Design a binder for this molecule. Structure first.
Ligand SMILES: N#CCNC(=O)c1ccc(-c2ccnc(Nc3ccc(N4CCOCC4)cc3)n2)cc1
Length: 265
């Protein structure tokens, strides 16, 4: 791994074609623990100092209990270092899948954590995410707080081959997205995540890509499986997140004031 002025790099947590994320203990503090994303400068489309630091200022100001904090930004001769809040529970995708499903009560707590993050971000006109359980992390396994993460560093630290890099998971992408579309795609995504939490797999889970495409392009309303049976409110919310016509899909205003979501926790 890389040696850094302020931290000791322990386990590998993540790997990309270009980046690597290590866990880290602060040197002279040790109880202080971070996740550090490392990216070689050679992999990046070079950028203004103005523009990059401007973007880092903006990311560091995106501070919410259910968003992974960018704590600091460092660099050396070879790399950049995005120093993040460490989430010790791992990703929401393992969490669901190793438990098969989450019961409605737990799903609910999680959705209100994720919605409170999304409302905050919506207020700031931040949107068009790649929301999925793999980019959502857990503060711990003990009574976990979910944390939205950005697994794809972008904008002024984008790579040279940005126009040849494929973006989105299609199991979480709003169909209008995969085929002109506003931030209401994020509400679709929330729907997929809720559905995956209650039923164990995204609505469009599939053996193959043609199978997947079929489902994305279909006009069938999404059928909720029979079990578990869920409260009338949960089912209302979920049906209205998973509406294909974005015009017909729930508003952000309605999502945030929706009874099942509370937002009077
Ligand atoms: N390169 C690349 C692609 N990955 C990321 O961008 C990425 C990965 C991890 C984190 C991150 C941030 C904060 N905390 C953590 N915690 C974390 C803890 C455990 C695990 N896993 C434990 C189980 O095995 C898989 C790793 C993953 C993340 N990760 C942020 C971005």
């Amino acid at each position: 791994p890389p040696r850094l002025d302020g931290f000791i790099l322990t386990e590998r947590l993540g790997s990309g074609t270009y980046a690597t994320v290590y866990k880290a203990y602060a040197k002279k503090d040790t109880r202080e623990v971070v996740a550090i994303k490392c990216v070689a400068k050679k992999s990046l489309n070079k950028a203004s100092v103005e523009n990059l630091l401007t973007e880092i200022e903006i990311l560091k100001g995106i501070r919410h209990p259910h968003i992974v904090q960018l704590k600091d930004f460092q660099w050396d001769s070879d790399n950049i270092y995005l120093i993040m809040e460490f989430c010790a529970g791992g990703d929401l995708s393992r969490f669901i899948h190793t438990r098969r499903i989450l019961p409605e009560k737990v799903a609910r707590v999680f959705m209100q954590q994720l919605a409170s993050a999304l409302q905050f971000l919506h207020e700031r006109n931040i949107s068009h995410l790649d929301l999925k359980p793999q980019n959502i992390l857990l503060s711990s396994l003990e009574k976990p707080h979910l944390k939205l993460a950005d697994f794809g560093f972008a904008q002024h630290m984008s790579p040279w081959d940005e126009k040849h890099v494929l973006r989105g998971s299609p199991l979480y992408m709003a169909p209008e997205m995969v085929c002109q579309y506003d931030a209401r795609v994020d509400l679709w995504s929330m729907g997929v995540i809720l559905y995956e939490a209650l039923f164990g797999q995204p609505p469009f889970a599939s053996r193959s890509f043609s199978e997947l495409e079929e489902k994305i392009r279909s006009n069938r309303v999404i059928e909720l499986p029979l079990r578990p049976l869920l409260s009338r409110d949960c089912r209302d919310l979920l049906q209205r997140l998973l509406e294909r016509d974005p015009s017909r899909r729930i508003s952000f205003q309605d999502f945030f004031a929706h009874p099942w979501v509370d937002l009077e926790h």
